[PDB]
Amino acid sequence: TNLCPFDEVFNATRFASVYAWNRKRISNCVADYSVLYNLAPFFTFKCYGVSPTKLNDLCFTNVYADSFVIRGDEVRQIAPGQTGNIADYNYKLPDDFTGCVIAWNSNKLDSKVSGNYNYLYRLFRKSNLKPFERDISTEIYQAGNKPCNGVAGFNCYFPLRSYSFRPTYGVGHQPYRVVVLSFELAPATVCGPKKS
């Protein structure tokens, strides 16, 4: 039994915008988290439906690592049963979520002083996202009964906004790389060291 490519997800070059989050699929490997010792010490770590240190001693069918960038004050929404424009139009965890959420400040990495307008989130959407759903379309959002069909105008709004990550900002406004481990329990193929 082999190790899991966690370092390949964190030490990864740059992350997707929250609206179009990455999901790397994980199967056939060993759950060693001390791999992560070295990074901006990755402080925010909370799990749901599972306990810490009961992890090296558990096995699940499949495991998913979702990754994206959001601003700090919006990290509280990456948790089951949240609301906010992120928890609703960008990335929704289910109410019964079992898994772990990890987030470190990436101000040193994704802030240009000119402004990093590469990180995007969906602002306008008719309805909430279903849990673990991804909306990629950049269709023009129809705010009026008068249809839009291409023209960005009154009651015709393009639905994504840049985050504008500047390093000056108060820490609420600073970028945060986030990785969400989904633990899904078919034969089991992802276990911890104490079960290798």
């Epitope: 609301t83 424009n85 609703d88 402004g115 602002l123 129809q142 705010a143 009026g144 906004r161 900002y169």
Partner: antibody
Framework: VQLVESGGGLIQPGGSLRLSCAAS????????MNWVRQAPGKGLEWVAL???????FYADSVKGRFTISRDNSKNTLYLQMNSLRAEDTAVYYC???????????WGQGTLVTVSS | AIQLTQSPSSLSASVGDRVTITCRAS??????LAWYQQKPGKAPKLLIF???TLQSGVPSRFSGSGSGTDFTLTISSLQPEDFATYYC??????????FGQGTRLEIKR
């Protein structure tokens, strides 16, 4: 083009009251909508917010007593007000919100006055 | 949360004068700020958003200026009708939106 509101008036302390603001030019079921109040000769104070996908948020001064609703059919937004304390006396404005572009359309005002 | 304070609170100025009201934030917010005009007995009117850009239907003598944590509304060719109370707002993506306490602008004649 237009946002027109109605439903305020006199009501005892502890009483209850339901404002309603109806829309022209845009469906409320598609927009972020807000209720902002203004005490007499005081400033502006944000009160509630409803997302296009229904997620609601309240200012603490009103949390658990107000409930901001809407009706997709009538194309109208509501603001149900219970446990009405006396400090709630103010003009109540509804407003359409384009979050990063500001509140571009506003209602005209309705005066909720809560006195015994 | 964030705090917005306007100066001055009151202000008298003569027709045609260039008047400048200022809005100071207790946190650097890039350009997420709107200026609102409220004539008495009326809802407020949006004048400026993105801290500098002019809303549609608004007279051009309104300078949206400032950036970072200090901003100014500058009306240049002051006019009799432009007597109102002027408010600034945090155009924030997360709920609790805040306005300044406002400036009362009185015309001198």
């Amino acid at each position: 083009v237009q946002l027109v509101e109605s439903g305020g008036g006199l009501i005892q302390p502890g009483g209850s009251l339901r404002l309603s603001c109806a829309a022209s030019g845009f469906i409320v079921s598609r927009n972020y909508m807000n209720w902002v109040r203004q005490a007499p000769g005081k400033g502006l104070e944000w009160v509630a917010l409803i997302y296009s996908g229904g997620s609601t948020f309240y200012a603490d001064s009103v949390k658990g007593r107000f409930t901001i609703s809407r009706d997709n059919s009538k194309n109208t937004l509501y603001l149900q007000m219970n446990s009405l304390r006396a400090e709630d006396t103010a003009v109540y404005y509804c407003a359409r919100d384009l979050v990063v572009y500001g509140l571009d359309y506003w209602g005209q005002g309705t005066l909720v006055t809560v006195s015994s | 949360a964030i705090q917005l304070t306007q100066s001055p609170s009151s202000l008298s100025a003569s027709v045609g004068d260039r008047v400048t009201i200022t809005c100071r934030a207790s946190q650097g917010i890039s350009s997420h700020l709107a200026w609102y005009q409220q004539k008495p007995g009326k809802a407020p009117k949006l004048l400026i958003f993105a801290a500098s850009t002019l809303q549609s239907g608004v007279p051009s003598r309104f300078s949206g200026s400032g950036s970072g944590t200090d901003f100014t509304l500058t009306i240049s060719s002051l006019q009799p009708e432009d007597f109102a109370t002027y408010y600034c707002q945090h155009l924030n993506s997360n709920p609790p939106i805040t306005f300044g306490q406002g400036t009362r602008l009185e015309i001198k004649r």
